[PDB]
Design a protein around this ligand. Structure first.
Ligand SMILES: Nc1ncnc2c1ncn2[C@@H]1O[C@H](COP(=O)(O)OP(=O)(O)OP(=O)(O)O)[C@@H](O)[C@H]1O
Ligand SMILES: Nc1ncnc2c1ncn2[C@@H]1O[C@H](COP(=O)(O)OP(=O)(O)OP(=O)(O)O)[C@@H](O)[C@H]1O
Ligand SMILES: [K+]
Lengths: 621, 346, 284
């Protein structure tokens, strides 16, 4: 496995082509899109002109290759008919006139056949080699586009949360592969009649009058394969679903290895599974039938068919079967039969490509556009909505303003809004409606470009947190290395799996929800220019007697540094310095004062909350 | 080791375990490939190719000068004089057939063979008329002797280089580090397969590492030697049975810093280059091996490979790299060296 | 046809190489079951209040099946239901020694089980066992098809699941029904009891324990009450546990030796005066 071959060619071809070619396609298609959505708006029109791969550049070669190949057998016949001639009858001494003398000689024809054969093979191979070199580029483009269109627009998902991995299941490797295959296979559909159509005409031109019958059967033989394909596919799909059931059942069975290893259900656990196999086996038999039949259809109809022509040879009433009359007919029959399988495959490939383009169109027209519209304080905005997704209302007296380095936490889970507010404070949620008025400068992404965060679900990002420590870290980075050596190894000293601390994360198979939240908080720790943003994780990550240890690591991290640390937590176990809080109930920031000033207003919920008894844990239980 | 999986290219391997110098030179002043170079490639061919070039050269020379002779026996009006079948050969005597009884290119070719390889069948001799033929005969013999000599030299030199078969010097695929005689020791095993001895043997162990300097310079691939720890400070070694060539390190050598955890991330690489002249051939040979950080199975100790048979010692070669993991202190490279208050940090 | 020939040769090579990946595990069997034990009654009785003594310096096993490579004297209490001290150093070895076999571990003369132990029919003897997984998750059905042996047990509705109270929530007053389980869940949809009703499964009389790792302490105490209800049916059991939440009210205990029980001593202060529960006293 040499990587030397790769060189720098991909950058010049695939990296450059994918990004640049579709830029033109987007420019043209969008430019047309402005006129009207009745006819103009579409997706696949741009690619032909924008990529501009000369398919024709090959298509021309493809047509040429088909013509040369179909010509070949007539040259084979030519030599054969003139097997015997003395040809000294006129005592010819005439220099062979180019118009006639050259075509006839037996010797020439053989060399011509060799040249034509080599040329045809070479031209064909080269044309679709270039075509493949273009297909690969198209695939790289399609992938580049799926990521470019998945990154900068679809950040906030509210309905796509029903099936978002369907796209990454189909458009990952079922769509791009389909388009690459369809582009690489178009020339067969494009120039098969130019050869076939030639055969009947050629056969009619030279075989005699039975040629029409002679090729009649194969034109219907091919639809036999086109018909067997669909039934075989249906059987295969049913078999696959049954196989999925078998695999799931087998997974459950092996998932109980210690239970079934010796207990009274040791061999019992496979019982239905065996029938399952047998059940699935039955479907396989059905599928096998069509496949075998299809081969027979592809292995007999030609032979059968050619016999028919010689039967229709008795409809010619000529002198006899001139061996220079039927050998070329058999050659044409054995050459014509090739592109038919390609045509039958293209028949299904077109449907696959159409389905793929429809799925892509649905994705790029399903909230993929419009979900991301186009001490360093930013917020003076009256607009009310601080609601999730494309949700309805809940907008009253909205405004917010917070001097950073303040632990403002809207402690409340009922009518919570903790995720909508946490995402919308940095603007990433569709709550920026109204007027956005900020300072004149950060010292237009809502004057919050210096962000850092933690999620409200287990993150588990690429590789692992041990390998997530890639922030310019050969060994130690002063702000987090210390927390890296001693705050990072604090939550779980070591996982059960081997390798301990180093590269611990890379190939780290699993995690605990407590370890997941600890790792998330740790990735919050190893950030630079620490102005951290947290979203109520410590009502579920409530590790008793370890939440203080995590908060003390963050203490030496943020309360022993010059840094802003915030949180919207829902537990009062960590309510130290919990001065600022909200109980909005479907509103923006409207509750802000001193540590005890809220209790000054003597709100009954505040009065019950602000008591000594366990910080009024569970309303002072 | 997925990080190493994606790091398969990032690797400090200056010399491949085979021994070659995995490197890359570029931007050099390649003057060209002068003619004589090709001749050197003629010497260093293999038997199948040498035999092919030999036979092809002889046949090409024969055919070429046969074609020349054919032209010569054409121009002198010789082939026609023979073709006149008024008699068996009516007027073929006086016409001074330039080369006697040369009838057609096949016959001329038989004459070429007969005149180059010194056979000389006599039936077809050069005559006293055509000086051009005599010129071509002189040219034939001169070129024949030069080609004969050159091909003989080629075949001989492929014969006189039959002493060389292959270098066979064997290392322990792995290193070993341990504690011996009270202090930390670095080991390695060296063995030989050839019956013949290796005279004036010597070994050298070097550390290759990227260095830094207080003045500010950095030498990217820095090499520094290390002692080979023999009893009287001498890089000599007798090689009858395989042995263990231990370069124990105190302070001057760069092993003071070594910490057991660091070995995975260690950047130092050990290179071993030993050499000597073979007794029965006269050629100076040199064998080199590389000890990368991934192959240094720390803490082990080597096994014993010498047994008393009936009257003569027996020796194994299967157990070369097999080790018994004798317990040893950890990271004592500085702790034991910079002796603590106990002065026995182990 | 040449392109076909070359490509098909490559395809055949790849296919046979893929097959050889599992043809090495085609028919290998490495745990035989050929027993010549004579017929035994094998009822569900308690023989003599369960005297368990089979190990005196439990020796090094063989065949690389997690052997214990030291010596651990074993001597437990006869009608003992609670656990006895087993230190982490040998705790895993003891845990494997509760019911799992080995090669040369604890083999020898024993006064236990009233029947031959290692030579019993290995196809059926194993049905008489009982164990519990460390963190019990049984992905199987075990409810809809809980009666894989032919029983009309007639107590999975409300009778002994509620009496076991482990499945009372899921059985007596639940609409799941006699035919509904949890897909790969011992805690997915049935979180009230990852371990089913023991009496219902017997509706034997020997319990084997596991370490409280993922079960809430209150629920564990309720399970302990259920363990007492079952102890009315056993009054002799083997248990393995290291924490006080499981080793609080232990009825019969022992004074151990370096990793295995050395002598029988139920109370706790006597073990405290000696080296009995000194390691256990580390928390109280
Ligand atoms: N992913 C989502 N799907 C549906 N509704 C959502 C989602 N995120 C937020 N909402 C709506 O936003 C409002 C505010 O939600 P809130 O932030 O209180 O949830 P939460 O308290 O984070 O949830 P949890 O209590 O599990 O942590 C809720 O009424 C909810 O209906
Ligand atoms: N009897 C022997 N014959 C040939 N080569 C040997 C022999 N003993 C050792 N070697 C060589 O020594 C090198 C390292 O041997 P090592 O001490 O690792 O034993 P090993 O683990 O059996 O080696 P390997 O894994 O290469 O078989 C190998 O490259 C091997 O070629
Ligand atoms: K010589």
């Amino acid at each position: 496995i040499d990587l030397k071959a790769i060189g720098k060619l991909p950058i010049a071809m695939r990296a450059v082509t994918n990004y640049v070619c579709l830029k033109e396609a987007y420019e043209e298609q969008k430019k047309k899109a402005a006129d009207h959505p009745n006819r103009t708006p579409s997706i696949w029109l741009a690619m032909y002109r924008a990529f501009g791969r000369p398919i024709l550049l090959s298509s021309t070669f493809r047509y040429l290759a088909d013509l040369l190949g179909f010509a070949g057998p007539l040259c084979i016949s030519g030599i054969v008919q003139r097997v015997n001639e003395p040809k000294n009858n006129t005592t010819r001494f005439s220099e062979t006139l180019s118009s006639k003398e050259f075509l006839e000689n037996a010797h020439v024809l053989a060399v011509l056949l060799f040249l034509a054969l080599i040329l045809q093979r070479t031209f064909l191979q080269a044309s679709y080699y270039v075509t493949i070199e273009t297909g690969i580029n198209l695939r790289g483009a399609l992938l580049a586009m799926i990521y470019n269109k998945i990154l900068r627009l679809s950040t906030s998902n509210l309905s796509m949360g029903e099936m978002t991995l369907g796209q990454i299941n189909n458009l990952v490797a079922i769509e791009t592969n389909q388009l690459m295959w369809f582009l690489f296979l178009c020339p067969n559909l494009w120039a098969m009649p130019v050869q076939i159509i030639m055969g009947v005409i050629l056969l009619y031109n030279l075989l005699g009058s039975s040629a029409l019958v002679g090729a009649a059967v194969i034109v219907l033989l091919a639809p036999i394969q086109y018909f067997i394909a669909t039934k075989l596919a249906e059987a295969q799909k049913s078999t696959l679903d049954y196989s999925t059931e078998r695999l799931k059942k087998t997974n459950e069975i092996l998932k109980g290895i210690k239970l079934l290893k010796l207990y009274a259900w040791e061999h019992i656990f496979c019982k239905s599974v065996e029938e399952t196999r047998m059940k699935e086996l039955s479907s396989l038999k059905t599928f096998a039938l069509y496949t075998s039949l299809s081969i027979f259809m592809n292995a007999a109809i030609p032979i059968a068919a050619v016999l028919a022509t010689f039967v229709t040879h008795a409809y010619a009433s000529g002198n006899n079967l001139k061996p220079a009359e039927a050998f070329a007919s058999l050659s044409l029959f054995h050459i014509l039969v090739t592109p038919l399988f390609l045509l039958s495959t293209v028949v299904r490939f077109a449907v696959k490509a159409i389905i793929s383009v429809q799925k892509l169109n649905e994705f790029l027209l399903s909230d993929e556009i419009g979900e991301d519209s186009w001490e360093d304080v930013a917020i003076k905005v009256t607009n009310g909505y601080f609601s999730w997704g494309s949700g309805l209302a809940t907008l009253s007296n909205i405004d917010i303003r917070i001097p950073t380095g303040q632990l403002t936490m809207i402690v409340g889970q009922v009518g919570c809004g903790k995720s909508s507010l946490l995402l919308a404070i940095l603007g990433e949620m569709q709550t920026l409606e109204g007027k956005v008025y900020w300072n004149n400068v950060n010292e237009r992404s809502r004057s919050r470009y210096s962000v850092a965060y933690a999620a409200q679900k287990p993150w588990l990002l690429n590789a692992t947190v041990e390998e997530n420590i890639t922030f310019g870290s050969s060994f130690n980075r002063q702000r987090y290395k210390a927390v890296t050596d001693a705050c990072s190894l604090q939550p779980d000293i070591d996982l059960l799996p081997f390798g301990d601390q180093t590269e611990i994360g890379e190939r780290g198979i699993n995690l605990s929800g407590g370890q997941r939240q600890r790792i998330c908080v740790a990735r919050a720790l190893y950030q630079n220019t620490n102005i951290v943003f947290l979203d109520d994780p410590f009502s579920a990550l409530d590790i008793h007697l370890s939440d203080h240890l995590m908060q003390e690591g963050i203490l030496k991290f943020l309360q022993d540094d010059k840094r802003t640390v915030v949180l919207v937590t829902h537990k009062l176990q960590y309510l130290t310095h919990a001065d600022w809080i909200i109980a909005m109930k479907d509103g923006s920031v409207l509750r802000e004062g001193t540590l005890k000033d809220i209790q000054t207003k003597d709100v009954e919920l505040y009065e019950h909350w602000k008591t000594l008894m366990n910080r009024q844990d569970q309303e002072l239980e | 080791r997925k990080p190493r999986i994606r790091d398969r290219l990032p690797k400090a391997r200056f010399i491949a375990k085979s021994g070659a110098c995995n490197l890359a030179h570029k931007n050099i002043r390649e003057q060209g490939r002068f003619l004589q170079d090709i001749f050197t490639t003629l010497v260093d061919l293999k038997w199948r190719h040498t035999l092919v070039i030999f036979t092809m050269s002889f046949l090409c020379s024969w055919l070429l000068f046969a074609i020349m002779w054919w032209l010569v026996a054409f121009a002198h009006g010789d082939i026609y004089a023979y073709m006149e079948k008024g008699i068996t050969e009516k007027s073929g005597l006086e016409s001074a057939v330039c080369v006697t009884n040369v009838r057609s290119f096949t016959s001329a070719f038989l004459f070429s063979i007969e005149v180059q390889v010194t056979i000389g069948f006599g039936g077809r001799m050069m005559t006293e008329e055509c000086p051009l033929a005599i010129t071509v005969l002189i040219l034939q013999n001169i070129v024949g002797l030069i080609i004969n000599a050159v091909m003989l030299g080629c075949i001989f030199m492929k014969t006189a280089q039959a002493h060389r078969r292959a270098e066979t010097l064997i290392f322990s695929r792995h290193a070993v580090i341990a504690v011996r005689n009270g202090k930390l020791c670095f080991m390695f095993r060296v063995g030989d397969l050839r019956k013949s001895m290796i005279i004036s043997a010597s070994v050298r162990i070097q550390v290759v590492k990227k260095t830094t300097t207080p003045e500010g310079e950095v030498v990217p691939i820095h090499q520094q030697d290390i002692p080979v720890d023999n009893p009287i400070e001498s890089n000599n070694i007798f090689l009858v049975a395989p042995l263990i060539i231990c370069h124990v390190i105190d302070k001057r050598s760069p092993l003071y810093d070594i910490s057991a955890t660091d070995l995975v991330n260690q950047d130092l690489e050990v290179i071993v280059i030993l050499e000597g002249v073979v007794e029965t051939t006269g050629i100076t040979t040199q064998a080199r091996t590389s000890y990368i950080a991934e192959e240094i199975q720390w803490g082990h100790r080597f096994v014993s490979i010498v047994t008393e048979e009936e009257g003569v010692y027996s020796v194994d070669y299967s157990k070369f790299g097999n080790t018994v993991r004798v317990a040893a202190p950890r990271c004592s490279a500085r702790e034991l060296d910079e002796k603590p208050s106990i002065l026995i940090q182990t | 046809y040449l392109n076909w020939v070359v490509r098909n040769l490559a395809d055949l090579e790849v296919q046979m190489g893929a097959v050889k990946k599992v043809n090495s595990f085609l028919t290998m069997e490495s745990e035989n079951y050929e027993g010549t034990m004579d017929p035994s009654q094998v009822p569900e009785h308690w023989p003599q209040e369960g005297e368990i003594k089979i190990h005196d310096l439990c020796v090094r096993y063989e065949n690389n099946l997690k052997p214990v490579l030291k010596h651990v004297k074993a001597y437990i209490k006869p009608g003992q239901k609670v656990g006895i001290c087993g230190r982490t150093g040998s705790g895993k070895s003891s845990l494997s020694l509760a019911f799992f076999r080995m090669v040369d571990i604890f083999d020898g003369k024993i006064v236990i089980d009233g029947i031959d132990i290692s030579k019993l029919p290995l196809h059926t003897l194993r049905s008489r066992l009982s164990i519990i997984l460390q963190d019990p998750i049984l992905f199987s059905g075990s409810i809809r098809f809980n009666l894989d042996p032919e029983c009309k047990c007639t107590d999975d509705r409300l009778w002994e699941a509620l009496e076991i109270a482990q499945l009372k929530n899921m059985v007596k007053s639940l609409p799941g029904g006699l035919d509904a389980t949890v897909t790969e869940g011992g805690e997915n949809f049935s979180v009230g009891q990852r371990q089913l009703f023991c009496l219902a499964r017997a509706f034997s009389s020997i319990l084997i324990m596991d370490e409280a790792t993922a079960s809430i302490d209150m629920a564990t105490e309720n399970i302990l009450q259920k363990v007492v209800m079952t102890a009315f049916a056993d009054r002799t059991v083997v248990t393995i546990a290291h924490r006080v939440h499981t080793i609080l009210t232990a009825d019969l205990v022992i004074v151990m030796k370096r990793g295995n029980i050395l002598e029988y001593d139920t109370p706790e202060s006597l073990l405290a005066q000696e080296d009995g529960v000194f390691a256990s006293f580390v928390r109280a």
